[PDB]
Design a protein around this motif. Structure first.
Motif, PDB file in Angstrom:
ATOM      1  N   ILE A 199       0.849  -1.185   0.000  1.00 48.70           N
ATOM      2  CA  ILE A 199       0.000   0.000   0.000  1.00 48.70           C
ATOM      3  C   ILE A 199       0.885   1.236   0.000  1.00 48.70           C
ATOM      4  CG2 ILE A 199      -1.727   1.321   1.258  1.00 48.70           C
ATOM      5  CD1 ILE A 199      -1.403  -2.423   1.851  1.00 48.70           C
ATOM      6  N   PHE A 200       0.630   2.144  -0.937  1.00 45.84           N
ATOM      7  CA  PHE A 200       1.326   3.420  -1.026  1.00 45.84           C
ATOM      8  C   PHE A 200       0.315   4.545  -0.872  1.00 45.84           C
ATOM      9  CE2 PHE A 200       5.796   3.189  -2.796  1.00 45.84           C
ATOM     10  CZ  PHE A 200       6.003   1.903  -2.348  1.00 45.84           C
ATOM     11  N   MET A 201       0.648   5.533  -0.045  1.00 43.89           N
ATOM     12  CA  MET A 201      -0.227   6.684   0.120  1.00 43.89           C
ATOM     13  C   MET A 201      -0.220   7.528  -1.147  1.00 43.89           C
ATOM     14  SD  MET A 201      -1.996   7.806   2.943  1.00 43.89           S
ATOM     15  CE  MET A 201      -1.643   9.539   2.662  1.00 43.89           C
ATOM     16  N   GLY A 202      -1.406   7.842  -1.654  1.00 45.12           N
ATOM     17  CA  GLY A 202      -1.526   8.614  -2.875  1.00 45.12           C
ATOM     18  C   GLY A 202      -1.252   7.807  -4.131  1.00 45.12           C
TER      19      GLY A 202
ATOM     20  N   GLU B  44      10.965   4.812  -0.721  1.00 43.78           N
ATOM     21  CA  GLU B  44      10.018   5.439  -1.589  1.00 43.78           C
ATOM     22  C   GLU B  44       9.287   6.501  -0.872  1.00 43.78           C
ATOM     23  OE1 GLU B  44       9.811   4.803  -4.716  1.00 43.78           O
ATOM     24  OE2 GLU B  44      11.230   3.135  -4.686  1.00 43.78           O
ATOM     25  N   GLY B  46       6.026   7.506  -0.394  1.00 47.59           N
ATOM     26  CA  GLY B  46       4.912   7.292   0.500  1.00 47.59           C
ATOM     27  C   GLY B  46       4.813   5.834   0.669  1.00 47.59           C
ATOM     28  N   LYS B  47       4.842   5.330   1.881  1.00 49.44           N
ATOM     29  CA  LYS B  47       4.892   3.900   2.039  1.00 49.44           C
ATOM     30  C   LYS B  47       4.218   3.602   3.305  1.00 49.44           C
ATOM     31  CE  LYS B  47       6.907   0.009   0.444  1.00 49.44           C
ATOM     32  NZ  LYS B  47       5.737  -0.750   0.959  1.00 49.44           N
ATOM     33  N   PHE B  48       3.502   2.497   3.368  1.00 48.64           N
ATOM     34  CA  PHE B  48       2.764   2.149   4.543  1.00 48.64           C
ATOM     35  C   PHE B  48       3.532   0.957   5.035  1.00 48.64           C
ATOM     36  CE2 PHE B  48      -1.520   2.634   6.357  1.00 48.64           C
ATOM     37  CZ  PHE B  48      -1.539   1.546   7.194  1.00 48.64           C
ATOM     38  N   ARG B  50       3.258  -2.101   6.892  1.00 50.20           N
ATOM     39  CA  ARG B  50       2.114  -2.849   7.356  1.00 50.20           C
ATOM     40  C   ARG B  50       2.416  -3.681   8.547  1.00 50.20           C
ATOM     41  NH1 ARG B  50       3.525  -4.703   2.284  1.00 50.20           N
ATOM     42  NH2 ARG B  50       3.299  -6.868   2.935  1.00 50.20           N
TER      43      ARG B  50
END
Lengths: 202, 50
Positions: A199-202, B44, B46-48, B50
Motif C-alpha cells: 500500500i502506497f499513500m496517494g 520510496e 509514501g509507504k505504509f 504494514r
C-alpha cells in the motif's frame, strides 16, 4: 469433509446419539440457511462474472438471484459492443435526478431494494457485468463450499440447535464454540485478502 | 610561553569531536516481530509499513 462425515461427527460429539439421523440433516441445512442470513460473508460465496442484457427504455435491472451484497473491490461495468467498457458509478437516488432526460450511454447507478437503476436512460440495448456475493444454493460449484471450508463452525451450530430443543444447558457451550470459530474465520479471511499486497499513500 | 594553553585548546576540541563521532547518527530501536520487514527497508516517498 462431506455430508456423511459431518453427520457422523455431529452424532458422535452430541453424546454418541444413534436414533436421530434425519433431524441432523434438517438442522444441518437450517444451519447453513441461518449462517447465510448474517452480516459476515466469507470469500467462498463470491460469484463469477455475470452479464445482463436489457431492452431500451428500461432503466431498472433486476437484482441477481441470490444477491447478498455486492463486492467492494469490484464494479458494474458496461461492455460496449466493441469489447471496450466503462465502470458505472454508484450514487443515491436523490443525487441522480438531475440526469433524467440528459442523453447518452449509461454512467451512474442506484440500488433501491430489488432493482439497479441506470439513470442516463439508454436508448438502445446494452449489456453490463457484475461481481457479487451469492447464497450458496445458487452458486455453480460442485459441492457446498461450506462443507469444505467451514465444517467445524457448522458442527457446533447444529449441535446447538439440537440441544436447545432438549433444553439442555450444554447449548451455550457450543454457541461459544461456534462464535470462536467464526471469529477465527474472519481473521483468516482478512489474512487471505491482504497477502502479498503493498500500500502506497496517494 | 603559550604552549601550556594551546594544549588545553586541543584537548577541548578533540574531546568534543570524539564524543560526536560515537553517538550522532540516526538509529532506531524496535520489536522485529510486529512488522513486515521489507517494508521498513524502502525509501520510496509514501509507504505504509504494514
Amino acid at each position: 469433509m462431506d455430508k456423511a462425515t459431518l453427520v457422523k461427527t455431529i452424532a458422535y460429539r452430541m453424546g454418541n446419539v444413534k436414533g436421530q439421523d434425519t433431524a441432523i440433516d434438517f438442522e444441518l441445512a437450517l444451519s447453513i440457511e441461518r449462517l447465510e442470513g448474517q452480516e459476515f460473508v466469507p470469500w467462498f460465496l463470491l460469484s463469477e462474472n455475470n452479464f445482463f442484457e436489457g431492452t431500451a427504455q428500461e432503466n431498472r435491472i433486476p437484482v441477481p438471484r441470490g444477491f447478498i451484497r455486492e463486492y467492494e473491490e469490484g464494479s458494474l461495468y458496461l461492455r460496449r459492443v466493441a469489447g471496450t467498457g466503462k465502470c458505472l458509478i454508484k450514487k443515491s437516488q436523490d443525487q441522480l435526478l438531475k440526469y433524467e432526460g440528459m442523453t447518452g450511454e449509461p454512467s451512474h447507478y442506484s440500488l433501491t431494494n430489488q432493482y439497479f437503476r441506470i439513470y442516463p436512460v439508454p436508448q438502445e440495448d446494452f449489456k453490463v457485468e457484475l461481481l457479487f456475493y451469492r447464497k450458496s444454493s445458487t452458486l455453480n460449484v460442485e459441492d457446498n463450499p461450506w462443507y469444505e471450508y467451514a465444517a467445524e463452525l457448522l458442527v457446533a451450530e447444529t449441535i446447538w440447535a439440537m440441544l436447545s430443543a432438549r433444553r439442555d444447558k450444554m447449548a451455550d457451550y457450543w454457541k461459544s464454540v461456534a462464535a470462536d470459530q467464526m471469529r477465527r474465520l474472519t481473521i483468516l479471511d482478512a489474512e487471505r485478502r491482504l497477502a502479498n499486497q503493498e500500500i502506497f499513500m496517494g | 610561553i603559550s604552549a601550556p594553553m594551546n594544549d588545553i585548546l586541543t584537548w577541548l576540541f578533540d574531546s568534543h569531536m570524539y564524543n560526536k563521532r560515537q553517538i550522532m547518527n540516526n538509529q532506531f530501536i524496535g520489536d522485529p516481530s510486529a512488522l513486515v520487514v521489507k517494508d521498513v527497508e524502502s525509501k520510496e516517498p509514501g509507504k505504509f509499513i504494514r
